[PDB]
């Protein structure tokens, strides 16, 4: 029941108010934080999160975390 | 307007895909705070104790907003 177990279909079906935190976590957990003094969205997220959504629409059966491959 | 992560109600939180609860709670607890983690972004022991308290808070107060946990 971890985020790494979430499918792309589950991701695109999330309450919209959950999609940004979930996408952020997938993109950033277990990576170096490069975003500055405070935790915030940054331009990388502006460009990547829409790509995650599109990737998951095209590949709903794949796990969300396969975006990183 | 009413569609942002900051606007999530406690009822919405307890109704989430269970796989989303930890990332949503983490973001609520950490967004806009000073980053005090190590080299990489990981859960810490404060998250271990606080995230269950977030779940309990929203179960007890479904009418309140998630982000009011911080108050």
Numbering used by the authors:
A (entry chain A): 32 to 100
B (entry chain B): 30 to 100
Original paper wording:
Two proteins, HdeA and HdeB, were discovered as abundant periplasmic proteins in stationary-phase Escherichia coli cells, and genetic studies implicated them in survival of extremely acid pH. HdeA and HdeB have been shown, in vitro, to have acid-activated chaperone functions; that is, by binding to acid-denatured proteins, they prevent these other proteins from irreversible aggregation and precipitation. Like HdeA, HdeB is dimeric at neutral pH but forms monomers at low pH (∼ pH 3.5). We have determined the structure of HdeB and the mechanism of its acid sensing, identifying two critical salt bridges that are broken upon exposure to low pH.
Here, we report the crystal structure of HdeB at pH 4.5 and biophysical characterization of HdeB at both acid and neutral pH. The asymmetric unit of the crystal contains four protein monomers with residues A30 to A102 ordered; six C-terminal residues and the His-tag are disordered. The monomeric structure is composed of two 12-residue helices (α2 and α3), three short (4 or 5 residues) helices (α1, α4, and α5), and interconnecting loops. Analysis with PISA13 reveals that the four monomers in the asymmetric unit are arranged as two identical dimers of HdeB. The dimer is identified as stable by the program PISA13 and the dimer interface buries in total 2400 Å2 of surface area, much of it involving hydrophobic residues. There are six main-chain intersubunit hydrogen bonds (akin to a β-sheet interaction) formed between the loop from each monomer that connects the two long helices. Two tryptophan residues (W55 and W56) and a tyrosine residue (Y64) from each monomer come together to make a cluster of aromatic residues at the C-terminal end of α2. The crystal structure shows an intersubunit salt bridge at the dimer interface of HdeB: E41 from one subunit with K48 from the other and internal salt bridge within each monomer D76–H59. Asp76 makes a polar contact with the indole nitrogen of Trp55 and a salt bridge with His59, which in turn stacks against the indole of W55. The two α2 helices in the HdeA dimer are almost parallel, whereas they are almost perpendicular in the HdeB dimer.
